[PDB]
Amino acid sequence: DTIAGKLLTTPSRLFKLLIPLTTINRKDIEQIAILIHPQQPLSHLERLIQSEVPPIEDENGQKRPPFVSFIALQLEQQRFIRWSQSTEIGDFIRDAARAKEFIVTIEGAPAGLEQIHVAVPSFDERTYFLRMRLRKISRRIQGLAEIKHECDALAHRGAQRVALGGFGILAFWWYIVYKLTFETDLGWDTMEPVTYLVSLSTLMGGYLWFLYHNREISYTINARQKKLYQMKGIDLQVWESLIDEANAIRREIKNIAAEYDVDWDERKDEQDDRV
Amino acid sequence: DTIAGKLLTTPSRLFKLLIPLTTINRKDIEQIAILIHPQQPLSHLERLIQSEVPPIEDENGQKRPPFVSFIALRFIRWSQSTEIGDFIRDAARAKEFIVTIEGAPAGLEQIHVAVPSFDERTYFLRMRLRKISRRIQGLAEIKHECDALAHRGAQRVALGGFGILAFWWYIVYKLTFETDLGWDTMEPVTYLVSLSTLMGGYLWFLYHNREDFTINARQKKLYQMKGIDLQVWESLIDEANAIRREIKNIAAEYDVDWDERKDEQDDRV
Amino acid sequence: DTIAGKLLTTPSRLFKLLIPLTTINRKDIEQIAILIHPQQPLSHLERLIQSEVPPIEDENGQKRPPFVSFIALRFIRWSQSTEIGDFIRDAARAKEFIVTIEGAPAGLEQIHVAVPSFDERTYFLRMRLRKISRRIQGLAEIKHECDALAHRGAQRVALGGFGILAFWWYIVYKLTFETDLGWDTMEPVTYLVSLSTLMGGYLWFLYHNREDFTINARQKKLYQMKGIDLQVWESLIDEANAIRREIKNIAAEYDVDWDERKDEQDDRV
Amino acid sequence: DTIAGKLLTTPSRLFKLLIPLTTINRKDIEQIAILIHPQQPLSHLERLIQSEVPPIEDENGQKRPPFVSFIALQLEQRFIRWSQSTEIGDFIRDAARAKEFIVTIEGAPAGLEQIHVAVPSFDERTYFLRMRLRKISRRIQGLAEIKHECDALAHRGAQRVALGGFGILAFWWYIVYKLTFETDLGWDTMEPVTYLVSLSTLMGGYLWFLYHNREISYTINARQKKLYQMKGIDLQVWESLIDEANAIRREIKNIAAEYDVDWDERKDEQDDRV
Ligand SMILES: [Ca+2]
């Protein structure tokens, strides 16, 4: 407005900042748009804001560029120290960003005060433009996880059916042994060897099923299912690629979170996936 | 020679461009080399060129260094913050690049460099991927024939065991169903043989020392001899896909469609 | 009167120093802040101090930069190729640091900065280590309580099962070893109960659906409710040890002995 | 000697190089040592060699120290001039694949007026990195062998109780044979006692199913965790030397990725023996 500014956070890597300053190409005072990359030296910013301002007339007559500066708040856990003209912008943004303070001293031109304060984006503000894409990719891997749960439901359909048939056959055997045993039409001593023979036969069949473990293609991955939900369903390369692209951003948000002394909790954004 | 240069890609991550400049004290042409990182600003390259050119004169009186301006594609000027990945991107579709230095030129006011492309840029990558994919393929097929070997040995030994136990079924059936010796004279044979195969199924635990060792574990024991482990293996496949997503990025953004079988068709030829 | 100065460690990786200089046309005293990464060479800092100071006229010809000289501790000049981390290391033992610009404005030509200590630097590490130690401690004891809780239910269910099966020992001892019904009238009770035991497993396998689920798996299912997973857990412990090896590095190089319980003695007081 | 130099690789991060040129009154030519960090700019290097040379008496005023310039080979799968403020390490890598580069002084006392310095090789860079890697790798292989022998101690502690179980089950086989075949007593009294024994060993084989008490893994057991640590050698040093050992292989494979020369540690398996 008058002595206030803001340095915004674009979704790209760049910044922008809007500062009011007098220019006679405009009428009185315009808030101007300046863009910044965080690997540019601070001399480029002072030359860039030095270029869109009508100059200070030299009282010696001959030397008319303006001489601008930058001053921050040295924190002692007041005091102010000026920053050299060849730091990168990003490191200064981080230091004054925890300081929550920024001024500019344009020499000569300011009629009164000559202290343009600007305001940095707080940790939540900086994070927001990361958290949107983080929440998006977490949402769609949650959906593909739900479809994996659906083919799990297919798997236990097959298991339940196979096991139901086995229980029916075991009930058949229990009734035929009881009927041919308690009725006293055949005694026990002709039912005992048939029991041992059947026990050998089911130890043979268990010796068949103990051979059956053909493929176990894991990584958490099955073998019956791997052809099932891929050659008719939804992919797995894209699943691991969204894992890979998803794991990177959380470290950046936690690094910037380390820079701001603010506890990053993703369970405090569990509440934002619902309303 | 005169107003023409070129930009080249290192085997590392960086770039290098070659521009015909005029240095502090030379003749009019010298193909000076400048090493740039691609995700980096553009004012950095402006500063790095303007370090090596004689400055502009008064100006009443100014000894200030020249001002370059990277117009590209008619003469759409580009700002001092767009990164070199994007400027080589849109210029790479344009196949043109103009650095118009001022003061220094004495009216020529132009420089043209030729942007490398996707076949050329990736060809460098393809070599990296072509070599590592061949190294995947050989170890793959050797691992497969080891799988066939351990599978065959396991099923032949299990087939022998089913042979002897089926023999036990046959002699119990014919001994107690012929009714020469009774089942009462057959009970000891069954239970005492059952402890005898707890014996013969228990000696193997201590001398030859299985301590699971199922069908799969014989193979996993086996290609400790015949091959290499799984960590190097998945590093090769996973890093191969890490290269493939990047050639999909660059060839996607350059908008020329590509599949990597088209140099497997040049691996043997 | 302003030959003083100090260097302060940022909470980030790269740290800054504060020196009194004269930039273009000012009064002689002004602090100027300069950001330094400790993997940069010394000559880089030499260049950044050369940027903001007026040049020196030396009689055909005027060197546009001055020349500074990072002597230290009895004075030993240090060459302009050492690491800044090493120069802060040996100077940190010395607790002194001297920059000496050749040009002297008016009888003042020296500058002392005061190299800080492992106390301040490693409380920019100790705040992190104390916070992660508190988090690990609380989550640890909650998981242990959860761990204790699972085994109570496991031993109750197992003790009940041993109760009824011991009853099955007593009833088959007493029914046929000493009493009226003989073993011939007892055998189908044993075998038919054995298939009836089996029926129980099938019912258990299908309605309440255990598809191992042993004693450890009740715990591992249980603190999915009461706690957090193991990957985050071992990430906190492993990164905590990564910080501990670095404070052992810095206190190993600055040579003041240290154990980290000595601030747990201030975590409650 | 006169037109050949070499830039070596010190055990530290920062290079050195030795080039012959003319100096103050002491000698005609001396291969002099220049110390270089790979992050200093190239103007620093030219100035460094511009400083230890007597200047040229240059008219039209006094601009006396020379202006030196670096030249390398632009591989075409010629000679270009590298700019005066690249960083040294990137120039080292690019001309390192070119295997030569050329310094030119302005004095030109020699007729050739060139200095073809030599380039450090893959065997030398990875020579020092390989000495570090093999030293720590041996230094964990010994502790791997001590893990092997305490594992053998656990093997002995198992084989005792397994031998006792085999002896007891042989005792049971013989007592069932004597009280069965002799016919002093008929099978119809050994049958009941067999079923009762089968219940009792299902109980004793049921209380062992609770005995899976601690399993502290990461590949790690729990029966031995007090034994090899609170009487033997640590595990913190084990995982720490793992952590310090995993980093260097990526650097050797990055520098190996630059030189287009294959990196095989099994071709260095042969160097741990002779
Ligand atoms: Ca019987």
PDB file of N, CA and C in Angstrom, chain A residues 73-128:
ATOM      1  N   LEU A  73      16.981  -8.183   9.850  1.00  0.00           N
ATOM      2  CA  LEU A  73      16.988  -8.182  11.305  1.00  0.00           C
ATOM      3  C   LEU A  73      17.901  -9.303  11.776  1.00  0.00           C
ATOM      4  N   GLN A  74      19.066  -8.935  12.290  1.00  0.00           N
ATOM      5  CA  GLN A  74      19.893  -9.888  13.010  1.00  0.00           C
ATOM      6  C   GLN A  74      19.198 -10.276  14.303  1.00  0.00           C
ATOM      7  N   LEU A  75      18.889 -11.558  14.450  1.00  0.00           N
ATOM      8  CA  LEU A  75      18.190 -12.052  15.624  1.00  0.00           C
ATOM      9  C   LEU A  75      19.208 -12.438  16.684  1.00  0.00           C
ATOM     10  N   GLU A  76      18.936 -12.035  17.923  1.00  0.00           N
ATOM     11  CA  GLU A  76      19.830 -12.253  19.050  1.00  0.00           C
ATOM     12  C   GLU A  76      19.303 -13.344  19.977  1.00  0.00           C
ATOM     13  N   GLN A  77      18.391 -14.179  19.464  1.00  0.00           N
ATOM     14  CA  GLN A  77      17.520 -15.076  20.243  1.00  0.00           C
ATOM     15  C   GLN A  77      16.839 -14.354  21.403  1.00  0.00           C
ATOM     16  N   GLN A  78      16.342  -2.134  18.153  1.00  0.00           N
ATOM     17  CA  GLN A  78      16.704  -3.495  17.786  1.00  0.00           C
ATOM     18  C   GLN A  78      18.066  -3.526  17.115  1.00  0.00           C
ATOM     19  N   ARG A  79      18.270  -4.477  16.208  1.00  0.00           N
ATOM     20  CA  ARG A  79      19.557  -4.625  15.545  1.00  0.00           C
ATOM     21  C   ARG A  79      19.331  -4.951  14.082  1.00  0.00           C
ATOM     22  N   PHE A  80      20.075  -4.283  13.213  1.00  0.00           N
ATOM     23  CA  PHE A  80      19.883  -4.380  11.778  1.00  0.00           C
ATOM     24  C   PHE A  80      21.240  -4.346  11.090  1.00  0.00           C
ATOM     25  N   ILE A  81      21.420  -5.223  10.105  1.00  0.00           N
ATOM     26  CA  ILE A  81      22.676  -5.380   9.378  1.00  0.00           C
ATOM     27  C   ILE A  81      22.363  -5.467   7.894  1.00  0.00           C
ATOM     28  N   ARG A  82      23.189  -4.847   7.067  1.00  0.00           N
ATOM     29  CA  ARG A  82      22.882  -4.855   5.650  1.00  0.00           C
ATOM     30  C   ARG A  82      23.591  -6.004   4.958  1.00  0.00           C
ATOM     31  N   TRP A  83      22.964  -6.511   3.904  1.00  0.00           N
ATOM     32  CA  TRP A  83      23.411  -7.716   3.223  1.00  0.00           C
ATOM     33  C   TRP A  83      24.158  -7.361   1.953  1.00  0.00           C
ATOM     34  N   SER A  84      25.236  -8.097   1.689  1.00  0.00           N
ATOM     35  CA  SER A  84      26.151  -7.760   0.610  1.00  0.00           C
ATOM     36  C   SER A  84      25.479  -7.934  -0.739  1.00  0.00           C
ATOM     37  N   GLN A  85      26.076  -7.326  -1.750  1.00  0.00           N
ATOM     38  CA  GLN A  85      25.429  -7.214  -3.042  1.00  0.00           C
ATOM     39  C   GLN A  85      25.680  -8.411  -3.939  1.00  0.00           C
ATOM     40  N   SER A  86      26.212  -9.508  -3.407  1.00  0.00           N
ATOM     41  CA  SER A  86      26.367 -10.692  -4.242  1.00  0.00           C
ATOM     42  C   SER A  86      26.066 -11.980  -3.492  1.00  0.00           C
ATOM     43  N   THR A  87      25.160 -11.943  -2.526  1.00  0.00           N
ATOM     44  CA  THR A  87      24.576 -13.187  -2.064  1.00  0.00           C
ATOM     45  C   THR A  87      23.530 -13.651  -3.065  1.00  0.00           C
ATOM     46  N   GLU A  88      23.240 -14.943  -3.051  1.00  0.00           N
ATOM     47  CA  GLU A  88      22.091 -15.384  -3.815  1.00  0.00           C
ATOM     48  C   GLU A  88      20.825 -14.972  -3.095  1.00  0.00           C
ATOM     49  N   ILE A  89      19.730 -14.927  -3.845  1.00  0.00           N
ATOM     50  CA  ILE A  89      18.490 -14.454  -3.256  1.00  0.00           C
ATOM     51  C   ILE A  89      17.903 -15.505  -2.330  1.00  0.00           C
ATOM     52  N   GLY A  90      18.009 -16.783  -2.702  1.00  0.00           N
ATOM     53  CA  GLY A  90      17.323 -17.837  -1.963  1.00  0.00           C
ATOM     54  C   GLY A  90      17.807 -18.013  -0.534  1.00  0.00           C
ATOM     55  N   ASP A  91      19.114 -17.874  -0.313  1.00  0.00           N
ATOM     56  CA  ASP A  91      19.659 -18.035   1.031  1.00  0.00           C
ATOM     57  C   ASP A  91      19.255 -16.871   1.927  1.00  0.00           C
ATOM     58  N   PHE A  92      19.245 -15.667   1.364  1.00  0.00           N
ATOM     59  CA  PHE A  92      18.753 -14.494   2.067  1.00  0.00           C
ATOM     60  C   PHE A  92      17.263 -14.591   2.368  1.00  0.00           C
ATOM     61  N   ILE A  93      16.492 -15.164   1.436  1.00  0.00           N
ATOM     62  CA  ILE A  93      15.067 -15.419   1.634  1.00  0.00           C
ATOM     63  C   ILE A  93      14.846 -16.378   2.789  1.00  0.00           C
ATOM     64  N   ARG A  94      15.695 -17.397   2.915  1.00  0.00           N
ATOM     65  CA  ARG A  94      15.521 -18.338   4.017  1.00  0.00           C
ATOM     66  C   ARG A  94      15.895 -17.716   5.359  1.00  0.00           C
ATOM     67  N   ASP A  95      16.989 -16.944   5.397  1.00  0.00           N
ATOM     68  CA  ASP A  95      17.436 -16.346   6.655  1.00  0.00           C
ATOM     69  C   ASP A  95      16.455 -15.297   7.171  1.00  0.00           C
ATOM     70  N   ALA A  96      16.134 -14.307   6.334  1.00  0.00           N
ATOM     71  CA  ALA A  96      15.096 -13.353   6.706  1.00  0.00           C
ATOM     72  C   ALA A  96      13.720 -14.003   6.812  1.00  0.00           C
ATOM     73  N   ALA A  97      13.531 -15.182   6.213  1.00  0.00           N
ATOM     74  CA  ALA A  97      12.259 -15.887   6.309  1.00  0.00           C
ATOM     75  C   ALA A  97      12.018 -16.416   7.708  1.00  0.00           C
ATOM     76  N   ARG A  98      13.046 -16.961   8.360  1.00  0.00           N
ATOM     77  CA  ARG A  98      12.823 -17.253   9.771  1.00  0.00           C
ATOM     78  C   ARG A  98      12.797 -15.962  10.587  1.00  0.00           C
ATOM     79  N   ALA A  99      13.486 -14.916  10.121  1.00  0.00           N
ATOM     80  CA  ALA A  99      13.430 -13.653  10.854  1.00  0.00           C
ATOM     81  C   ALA A  99      12.081 -12.943  10.749  1.00  0.00           C
ATOM     82  N   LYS A 100      11.303 -13.215   9.691  1.00  0.00           N
ATOM     83  CA  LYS A 100       9.987 -12.604   9.428  1.00  0.00           C
ATOM     84  C   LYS A 100      10.070 -11.078   9.357  1.00  0.00           C
ATOM     85  N   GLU A 101      11.001 -10.586   8.539  1.00  0.00           N
ATOM     86  CA  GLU A 101      11.386  -9.180   8.513  1.00  0.00           C
ATOM     87  C   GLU A 101      12.239  -8.930   7.276  1.00  0.00           C
ATOM     88  N   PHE A 102      12.068  -7.755   6.682  1.00  0.00           N
ATOM     89  CA  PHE A 102      12.687  -7.408   5.409  1.00  0.00           C
ATOM     90  C   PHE A 102      12.487  -5.911   5.288  1.00  0.00           C
ATOM     91  N   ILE A 103      13.534  -5.134   5.033  1.00  0.00           N
ATOM     92  CA  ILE A 103      13.315  -3.750   4.638  1.00  0.00           C
ATOM     93  C   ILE A 103      14.144  -3.500   3.387  1.00  0.00           C
ATOM     94  N   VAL A 104      13.911  -2.349   2.757  1.00  0.00           N
ATOM     95  CA  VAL A 104      14.698  -1.856   1.629  1.00  0.00           C
ATOM     96  C   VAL A 104      14.935  -0.367   1.854  1.00  0.00           C
ATOM     97  N   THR A 105      16.162   0.096   1.623  1.00  0.00           N
ATOM     98  CA  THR A 105      16.499   1.515   1.718  1.00  0.00           C
ATOM     99  C   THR A 105      16.904   2.017   0.335  1.00  0.00           C
ATOM    100  N   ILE A 106      15.956   2.574  -0.404  1.00  0.00           N
ATOM    101  CA  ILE A 106      16.291   3.298  -1.624  1.00  0.00           C
ATOM    102  C   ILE A 106      16.811   4.671  -1.232  1.00  0.00           C
ATOM    103  N   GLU A 107      18.036   4.981  -1.639  1.00  0.00           N
ATOM    104  CA  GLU A 107      18.650   6.262  -1.310  1.00  0.00           C
ATOM    105  C   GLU A 107      18.063   7.441  -2.084  1.00  0.00           C
ATOM    106  N   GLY A 108      17.907   8.575  -1.404  1.00  0.00           N
ATOM    107  CA  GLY A 108      17.412   9.792  -2.026  1.00  0.00           C
ATOM    108  C   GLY A 108      15.942   9.940  -2.384  1.00  0.00           C
ATOM    109  N   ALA A 109      15.413   8.988  -3.146  1.00  0.00           N
ATOM    110  CA  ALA A 109      14.030   9.049  -3.619  1.00  0.00           C
ATOM    111  C   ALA A 109      12.939   9.060  -2.547  1.00  0.00           C
ATOM    112  N   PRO A 110      13.093   8.254  -1.487  1.00  0.00           N
ATOM    113  CA  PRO A 110      12.021   8.267  -0.485  1.00  0.00           C
ATOM    114  C   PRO A 110      11.881   9.635   0.174  1.00  0.00           C
ATOM    115  N   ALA A 111      10.686  10.214   0.083  1.00  0.00           N
ATOM    116  CA  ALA A 111      10.426  11.530   0.667  1.00  0.00           C
ATOM    117  C   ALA A 111      10.514  11.517   2.189  1.00  0.00           C
ATOM    118  N   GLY A 112       9.926  10.485   2.783  1.00  0.00           N
ATOM    119  CA  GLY A 112       9.920  10.304   4.221  1.00  0.00           C
ATOM    120  C   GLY A 112      10.055   8.826   4.504  1.00  0.00           C
ATOM    121  N   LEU A 113      10.664   8.486   5.644  1.00  0.00           N
ATOM    122  CA  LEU A 113      10.891   7.100   6.121  1.00  0.00           C
ATOM    123  C   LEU A 113      11.938   6.268   5.355  1.00  0.00           C
ATOM    124  N   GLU A 114      11.744   6.108   4.044  1.00  0.00           N
ATOM    125  CA  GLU A 114      12.656   5.371   3.173  1.00  0.00           C
ATOM    126  C   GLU A 114      12.886   3.969   3.712  1.00  0.00           C
ATOM    127  N   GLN A 115      11.814   3.335   4.172  1.00  0.00           N
ATOM    128  CA  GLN A 115      11.932   1.988   4.728  1.00  0.00           C
ATOM    129  C   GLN A 115      10.794   1.138   4.175  1.00  0.00           C
ATOM    130  N   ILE A 116      10.965   0.608   2.970  1.00  0.00           N
ATOM    131  CA  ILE A 116       9.931  -0.225   2.374  1.00  0.00           C
ATOM    132  C   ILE A 116      10.008  -1.592   3.035  1.00  0.00           C
ATOM    133  N   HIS A 117       9.085  -1.880   3.934  1.00  0.00           N
ATOM    134  CA  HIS A 117       8.991  -3.223   4.471  1.00  0.00           C
ATOM    135  C   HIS A 117       8.325  -4.119   3.443  1.00  0.00           C
ATOM    136  N   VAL A 118       8.772  -5.371   3.345  1.00  0.00           N
ATOM    137  CA  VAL A 118       7.983  -6.360   2.626  1.00  0.00           C
ATOM    138  C   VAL A 118       7.799  -7.570   3.534  1.00  0.00           C
ATOM    139  N   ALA A 119       6.823  -8.409   3.189  1.00  0.00           N
ATOM    140  CA  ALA A 119       6.491  -9.596   3.986  1.00  0.00           C
ATOM    141  C   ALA A 119       6.633 -10.948   3.273  1.00  0.00           C
ATOM    142  N   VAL A 120       7.383 -11.833   3.922  1.00  0.00           N
ATOM    143  CA  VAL A 120       7.675 -13.172   3.429  1.00  0.00           C
ATOM    144  C   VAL A 120       6.516 -14.138   3.633  1.00  0.00           C
ATOM    145  N   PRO A 121       6.484 -15.221   2.843  1.00  0.00           N
ATOM    146  CA  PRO A 121       5.425 -16.218   2.992  1.00  0.00           C
ATOM    147  C   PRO A 121       5.810 -17.191   4.098  1.00  0.00           C
ATOM    148  N   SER A 122       4.883 -17.398   5.025  1.00  0.00           N
ATOM    149  CA  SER A 122       5.083 -18.243   6.191  1.00  0.00           C
ATOM    150  C   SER A 122       5.232 -19.678   5.739  1.00  0.00           C
ATOM    151  N   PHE A 123       5.652 -20.548   6.650  1.00  0.00           N
ATOM    152  CA  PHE A 123       5.912 -21.937   6.298  1.00  0.00           C
ATOM    153  C   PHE A 123       4.692 -22.607   5.684  1.00  0.00           C
ATOM    154  N   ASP A 124       3.505 -22.374   6.232  1.00  0.00           N
ATOM    155  CA  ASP A 124       2.312 -22.972   5.651  1.00  0.00           C
ATOM    156  C   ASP A 124       2.117 -22.470   4.220  1.00  0.00           C
ATOM    157  N   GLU A 125       2.320 -21.173   4.009  1.00  0.00           N
ATOM    158  CA  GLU A 125       2.155 -20.592   2.688  1.00  0.00           C
ATOM    159  C   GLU A 125       3.125 -21.213   1.698  1.00  0.00           C
ATOM    160  N   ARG A 126       4.377 -21.389   2.106  1.00  0.00           N
ATOM    161  CA  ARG A 126       5.356 -21.976   1.205  1.00  0.00           C
ATOM    162  C   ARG A 126       4.981 -23.411   0.881  1.00  0.00           C
ATOM    163  N   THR A 127       4.573 -24.130   1.918  1.00  0.00           N
ATOM    164  CA  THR A 127       4.188 -25.525   1.804  1.00  0.00           C
ATOM    165  C   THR A 127       2.946 -25.749   0.956  1.00  0.00           C
ATOM    166  N   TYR A 128       1.961 -24.872   1.110  1.00  0.00           N
ATOM    167  CA  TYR A 128       0.699 -25.047   0.385  1.00  0.00           C
ATOM    168  C   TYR A 128       0.928 -25.433  -1.064  1.00  0.00           C
TER     169      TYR A 128
END
